[PDB]
A paper describes a structure:
In most cells, the detoxification of sulfite by oxidation to sulfate (Equation 1) is catalyzed by sulfite oxidizing enzymes (SOEs). Here, we have investigated an electron transfer complex involving the periplasmic [name] sulfite dehydrogenase from the α-Proteobacterium [name], which represents a structurally uncharacterized type of SOE, and its electron acceptor, the c-type cytochrome SorU. In [name] the [name] sulfite dehydrogenase is part of a sulfite detoxification system that is induced in response to the degradation of sulfur containing substrates such as the organosulfonate taurine. Electrons derived from sulfite oxidation are passed on to the SorU cytochrome, and likely then to cytochrome oxidase, as [name] is capable of sulfite respiration.
In order to investigate whether there are any structural reasons for these differences, we solved the crystal structure of [name] by molecular replacement and refined it to 2.4 Å resolution. The structure shows two homodimeric assemblies per asymmetric unit, which is in agreement with the quaternary structure as determined by MALLS. Unexpectedly however, within the [name] homodimer the protomers are oriented in a head-to-tail orientation, a subunit arrangement that has not been previously observed in structures of sulfite-oxidizing enzymes. Nevertheless, the fold of the [name] monomers is similar to those of other SOEs, comprising a central ‘SUOX-fold’ domain that harbors the Mo active site and a ‘dimerization’ domain. Within the [name] dimer, the subunit interface involves both the 'SUOX-fold' and the ‘dimerization’ domains, resulting in a buried surface area of ~1280 Å2 per monomer, which is approximately 9% of the solvent-accessible surface of each monomer. INSET: a closer view of the molybdenum binding-site: the molybdenum atom (green sphere) is coordinated by two dithioline ligands from the molybdopterin (yellow spheres), residue Cys 127, an axial oxo ligand and an equatorial hydroxo or water ligand (red spheres). [name] was crystallized by hanging drop vapor diffusion with drops consisting of equal volumes (2 μL) of protein and crystallization solution (0.1 M HEPES pH 7.5, 8% ethylene glycol, 0.1 M manganese (II) chloride tetrahydrate and 17.5% PEG 10,000) at 20°C. Crystals were cryoprotected in reservoir solution with 30% glycerol before flash-cooling in liquid nitrogen. The resulting model was refined by iterative cycles of amplitude based twin refinement (using twin operators H, K, L and –H, -K, L with estimated twin fractions of 0.495 and 0.505 respectively) within REFMAC, interspersed with manual inspection and correction against calculated electron density maps using COOT. The refinement of the model converged with residuals R = 0.208 and Rfree = 0.239.
Author numbering:
A (entry chain A): 35 to 399
B (entry chain B): 37 to 399
The structure:
């Protein structure tokens, strides 16, 4: 399957093209430098990408800020005057790990959606303006405000109900201090593929909440009742419809997976590495096992600490005999949350973080 | 753009020569890490052919000056350890333009007139030299230097010492030195020293040997031209000689990176990059009036370590006019940038705060 027009610049050999809206990073392509190369970063769109014309005048891009004491519309040019913040986060789809839930289906049980393994995730550095600074410039939040609600800038088709298609998401207002209106990713102007010219980055939260080409940010008393917030991206049992009484895919859980080696290794000393994060919290420690979870050893963190929303690279130096190993990692966050062996089933297949499913088969020769 | 860097971003680079590409001041970004396609280039000799990347894991490195000396492949090196570190990769020439501006009368200085773009901050990943040396029994008794040899093919007939890119640094750097196969998450490019590079954190660019084919623990510095007489700190009109200081440790330095030319009157975000070389940057001051008044700046983004640089920013409310933006950094040991750097003949190691001032026209 060929790389779509809007991501022709990406690295075809590093990606699994599930659909034109769905590209997964290969497990062997994450690297050990923490930061995921831009041309290898995964893609997940719910609707078609806007035209490249929206990047012609980046500084002219408009964002309606409401739910504040002094509401008005500000340009990216203006936003650039109000502040500057840089932060590393784990950008991951709630769908990441869905394949593993599908593997657990018995009988006539069925689950739709992209069968992501581990490649629907990356760690990237964002740069932009803190939402707090933007809200404080406009007098602060309106009294009684409970949510940050961001609206994707895609053109909606005329005639149809906009709420059925709009990419609009709501997160609690306690995230205000963390939220970034970002125009830059990994040192470059933000690409169209990843939400340029401006993206609402919500650290620690799942991909869906990080709104590409954000054209509106509202401090609201209620969640948006858009389809994508009200019934979609909800955690429910098999056979249940989604509904707003259920937990939405917000905070990311503690998670990890092994990234290297991916298939083969020579007998003797082998460096086993991977990535680990705690979502809202930093990863405190990681254990690695070469025998599918029977025996565990403490791993070392590799590289610098990019913050509690980022991931760490970890490594275990293992001396291995000839054979077929089953490499798995189990991470713990700073609050004591640890990955389970398996994740409790849910109907849409969101938020997998089990350690057994994503095991790497290492043939040691 | 030359063949070996055709993948780079032409609009982000100033092409001085086929061996010399400078990053534009407006292209550093505020994410700390310098985009690979925008990273500067400085070669002393022609780049090897792209064929050396065909078999990366098969690339050979002669390790000597150890108890049990032998040649190891990149494949083997990958088994011995793993390390990741962010460093400031900067040419000793960076800032040479500013030294040339200080020349009076019939004084002359050769070399690329770099301003501030002969530098980047990048994440390396590879194997610690210490682990490689420990696997081979440790350093030979009496070893004083880490000497690395560039893998370029030398022309036959000519004295190899006149052209070889071979550099020596003190052995106290052993714990920091990385034999790196990866940069910013990707396999290391040919342009930046792939398939394997000797990264010496805190030291100037010249010491970070591309396509390293030999690493020796030696009792003496290599007497190669590039080490013995070149890259030495001397006065105007003096020849270089090995009694003089070599361009080793980087001094505390900074420069403003944004905005680069224009801004609207009112609130303006003034940002830049700062590092202490061997030491972390502790603090940065920014001035909008060419050094008459100073204000403390904030650090922006995460701390990538003592060898890296920090992004800093000052939020300034500015009236209409023409400002002169300058930054002055201090390291964790109290070393601070001077206004100007003492002159030296080859124009190495500029770190003054006045010369690299940005002219901001506020409308
Ligand atoms: N505007 C917008 N935004 C947005 C969207 C769309 O569609 N639109 N998607 C989501 C999702 S869903 Mo699941 O949870 S993941 C995800 C993400 C992805 O990212 P990238 O593509 O950059 O990777 O994004 C996010 N944001
Ligand atoms: N092998 C080799 N390496 C090498 C060389 C040569 O020539 N060769 N150069 C130096 C120098 S000098 Mo003055 O100090 S700066 C510098 C650097 C740069 O890097 P990039 O190009 O990658 O950026 O490199 C380094 N390394």
């Amino acid at each position: 399957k060929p790389l779509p027009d809007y991501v022709a610049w990406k690295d075809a050999d590093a990606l699994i093209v599930h659909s034109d809206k769905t590209l997964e990073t290969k497990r062997s392509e994450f690297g050990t430098s923490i930061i995921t190369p831009e041309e290898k970063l995964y893609i997940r769109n719910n609707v078609n990408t806007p035209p490249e014309s929206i990047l012609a005048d980046r500084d002219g891009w408009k964002v309606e800020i409401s739910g504040v004491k002094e509401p008005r519309t500000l340009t990216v040019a203006e936003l650039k005057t109000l502040g500057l913040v840089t932060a590393a986060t784990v950008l991951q789809c709630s769908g990441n790990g869905r394949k593993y839930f599908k593997d657990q289906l018995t009988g006539d049980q069925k689950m739709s959606g992209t069968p992501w393994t581990v490649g629907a995730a990356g760690c990237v550095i964002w740069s932009g303006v803190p939402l707090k600074a933007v809200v404080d410039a406009l007098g602060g939040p309106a009294e009684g405000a409970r949510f940050i609600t961001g609206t994707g800038g895609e053109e909606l088709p005329a005639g149809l109900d906009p709420k059925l298609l709009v990419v609009e998401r709501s997160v609690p207002i306690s995230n205000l201090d963390n939220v970034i209106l970002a125009w830059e990713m990994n040192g470059r102007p933000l690409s169209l593929a990843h939400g340029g010219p401006l993206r609402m980055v919500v650290p620690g939260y799942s991909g869906v909440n990080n709104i590409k080409y954000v054209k509106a940010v509202a401090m609201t008393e209620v969640e948006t009742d858009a389809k994508i917030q009200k019934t979609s991206y909800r955690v429910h049992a098999l056979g249940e419809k989604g509904s707003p009484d259920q937990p939405s895919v917000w905070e990311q859980p503690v998670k990890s997976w092994i990234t290297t080696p991916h298939e083969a290794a020579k007998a003797g000393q082998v460096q086993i590495a991977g990535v680990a994060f705690g979502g809202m919290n930093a990863c405190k420690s990681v254990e690695v096992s070469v025998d599918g979870g029977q025996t565990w050893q403490e791993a070392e963190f590799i590289g610098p600490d990019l913050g509690r929303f980022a991931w760490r690279v970890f490594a275990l130096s293992a001396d291995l005999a000839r054979g077929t190993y089953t490499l798995v990692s189990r991470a713990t966050d700073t609050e004591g949350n640890v990955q389970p062996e398996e994740t409790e089933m849910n109907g849409a297949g969101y938020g997998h973080n089990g350690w057994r499913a994503p095991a790497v088969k290492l043939t040691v020769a």
